[PDB]
Specification:
part of a larger assembly; 2 chains; A: 51 residues; mainly alpha; B: mainly alpha; hydrolase; V-type proton ATPase subunit D
């Protein structure tokens, strides 16, 4: 999973760079401004693995 | 034992003497020994209780010239369920095996509540043969013992590592343990299971396992009986 996450992070960084180049400016300021709430949330699940 | 010795040796018939409450007999030995000025021994029983039990037991056995045998089932009682007690210890010493009746099995309601794991017949190899009983007796007995021990271990481990995390050979072993305690060991007090019928029931129990799982059975016996 660490190897896969590294590969996926590299791909996402390349995609973000391409998107920024297409837009002509950094969308970081806009993303920070539109940070009122999070669209993605994580809920913990207590799975019983072995004992 | 004198009646058994007569019948067997001067009448040529197999006896199977069944003594009961050898613990009561040893208590009687204690009472008679202390009738004299004899000092009590380890736990009140006399020092010669080994000799007395040895006589009582070794009054049995097969002999050469006579076509008759004497077999003994002393049906001993443990006072405090202690194998370390002098009566069970000596009786074990003189005798040639042990059949354990278990409080746990009795409380679970299984009759007869005989616990296989500690029980063994020291001359099992002689009784379980080809001409006598059936040709699969020894292998089936060994396989049943192995799978019963594995079932007890899996029952202990189920409440520790969950039922799901147990192996396939452990889930099958739990199923075998249930079908073994509740169907094989559990025998009605008035139903007669001949050795061949009990062997067939044992094979029916062993058939839940795949043929590869039964490791202790010889391949020829697996091919013939499974």
């Amino acid at each position: 999973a660490k190897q896969k996450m590294g590969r996926v992070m590299q791909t996402a960084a390349f995609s973000l760079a391409e998107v920024s180049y297409a837009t002509g400016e950094n969308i970081g300021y806009q993303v920070q401004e539109s940070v009122s709430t999070a669209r993605f949330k994580v809920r913990a699940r207590q799975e019983n693995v072995s004992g | 034992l004198t009646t058994a010795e007569y019948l067997a040796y001067q009448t040529e018939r197999h006896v199977l003497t069944i003594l009961t409450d050898m613990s009561s007999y040893a208590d009687a030995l204690r009472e008679v020994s202390a009738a004299r000025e004899e000092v009590p021994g380890r736990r009140g029983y006399p020092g010669y209780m080994y000799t007395d039990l040895s006589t009582i037991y070794e009054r049995a056995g097969r002999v050469e010239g006579r076509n008759g045998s004497i077999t003994q089932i002393p049906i001993l009682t443990m006072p405090n369920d202690d194998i370390t007690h002098p009566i069970p210890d000596l009786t074990g010493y003189i005798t040639e095996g042990q059949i354990f009746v278990d409080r746990q099995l009795h409380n679970k309601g299984i009759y007869p509540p005989i616990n296989v794991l500690p029980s063994l017949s020291r001359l099992m190899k002689s009784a379980i043969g080809e001409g006598m009983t059936r040709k699969d007796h020894g292998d089936v007995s060994n396989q049943l013992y192995a799978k019963y021990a594995i079932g007890k271990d899996a029952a202990a481990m189920k409440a520790v590592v969950g039922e799901e995390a147990l192996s396939i050979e452990d889930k099958l072993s739990l199923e075998f343990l249930e079908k073994f305690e509740k169907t094989f060991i559990t025998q009605g007090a008035y139903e007669d299971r001949t050795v061949f019928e009990s062997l067939d029931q044992a094979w029916s129990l062993l058939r839940i396992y795949p043929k590869e799982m039964l490791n202790r059975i010889s391949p020829k016996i697996l091919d013939e009986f499974y």
